[PDB]
C-alpha cells in the first residue's frame, strides 16, 4: 500500500500511510516537481520532521526507490512568521540550487537578477519566493522604498524579504525575490506548497528557457487604482508606447 498525494504544483508526498491513512512514518518522502529530487525520512501527518536529500532512482510497482545524497543534508518544516524568515537563512534549497543563480541583471540599473543554470522546458518550477509573513495593512501604510520585495500571497498575507535579507550573504534559503520585472516576461508567480517553507509562491517558466537566460516575471502592480515604484511607472510608459 504505497500512496502518492500530489499538490496542484506537481510536488508530492509518497509513502506507506499509517492505520489512519496519514503520511506518518520514517520512510515518507516529499518529491519535488522534477519527479527526481526528494526529501526522504520522518514525517508526521504530512509534515516534514527530518527530510534527508535523496534522488528518486526508480519506481517498482509504484514504490519509489531512493538513493541518499552524501553530507548530512537534512531539512524540516520551518514556516516563516512575521519576524522570522527561516531557522536556516543560509541553507539553500537543493532543488532551486541546481536551477538558478544570482548575477548582475541584463536590465539597465536593475541591480542583481536571477538566471537559469540549465536549459528547461515550459511550466518548470525554477525558484521559491519565501519571506516573512506580514499584513496588507502594514505594507500598504509604508513607503515604496520598503516595498521592493513584497509579494501578495493571498487576501490576508504579504510575503516580504526585508533588509538585510535582500542580500544573498545574509539570506539564500530561497531566491525568488531576485527575479526582475518584465512586461514581456518568461516566467510567472504561481502558488506552491513547500515542505520546508509551507504555502508560498514559486517562479514557473511560461516557455522553454536556455541556460544563462535571465528569468523575469510581471510584477502585476495596479495600473489604474498607477500604485507602483517610479522605475516601474517609467517602464509602463515605455511598454504601452
Amino acid at each position: 500500500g504505497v500512496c502518492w498525494i500530489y499538490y496542484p504544483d506537481g510536488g508530492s508526498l509518497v509513502g506507506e500511510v499509517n492505520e489512519d491513512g496519514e503520511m506518518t512514518g520514517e520512510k515518507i518522502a516529499y518529491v519535488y516537481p522534477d519527479e527526481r529530487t526528494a526529501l526522504y525520512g520522518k514525517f508526521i501527518d504530512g509534515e516534514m520532521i527530518e527530510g534527508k536529500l535523496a534522488t528518486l532512482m526508480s519506481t517498482e510497482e509504484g514504490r519509489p526507490h531512493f538513493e541518499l545524497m552524501p553530507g548530512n543534508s537534512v531539512y524540516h518544516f520551518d514556516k516563516s512568521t512575521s519576524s522570522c524568515i527561516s531557522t536556516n537563512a543560509l541553507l539553500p534549497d537543493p532543488y532551486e540550487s541546481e536551477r538558478v543563480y544570482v548575477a548582475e541583471s541584463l536590465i539597465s540599473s536593475a541591480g542583481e537578477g536571477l538566471f537559469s543554470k540549465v536549459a528547461v522546458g515550459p511550466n518548470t518550477v525554477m525558484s521559491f519566493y519565501n519571506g516573512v509573513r506580514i499584513t496588507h495593512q502594514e505594507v500598504d501604510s509604508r513607503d515604496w522604498a520598503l516595498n521592493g520585495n513584497t509579494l501578495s500571497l493571498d487576501e490576508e498575507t504579504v510575503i516580504d524579504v526585508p533588509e538585510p535579507y535582500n542580500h544573498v550573504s545574509k539570506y539564500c534559503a530561497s531566491l525568488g525575490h531576485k527575479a526582475n520585472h518584465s512586461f514581456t516576461p518568461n516566467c510567472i508567480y504561481d502558488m506552491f506548497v513547500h515542505p520546508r517553507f509551507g504555502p508560498i509562491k514559486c517562479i514557473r517558466t511560461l516557455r522553454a528557457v536556455e541556460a544563462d537566460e535571465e528569468l523575469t516575471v510581471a510584477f502585476g502592480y495596479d495600473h489604474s487604482p498607477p500604485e507602483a515604484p517610479e522605475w516601474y511607472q517609467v517602464e509602463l510608459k515605455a511598454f504601452q508606447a
Binding site: G220, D222, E227
Partner: peptide, 6 residues
C-alpha cells in the same frame, strides 16, 4: 496594493 501579484 503595495505588493506584487495581488
Amino acid at each position: 496594493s503595495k505588493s506584487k501579484d495581488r
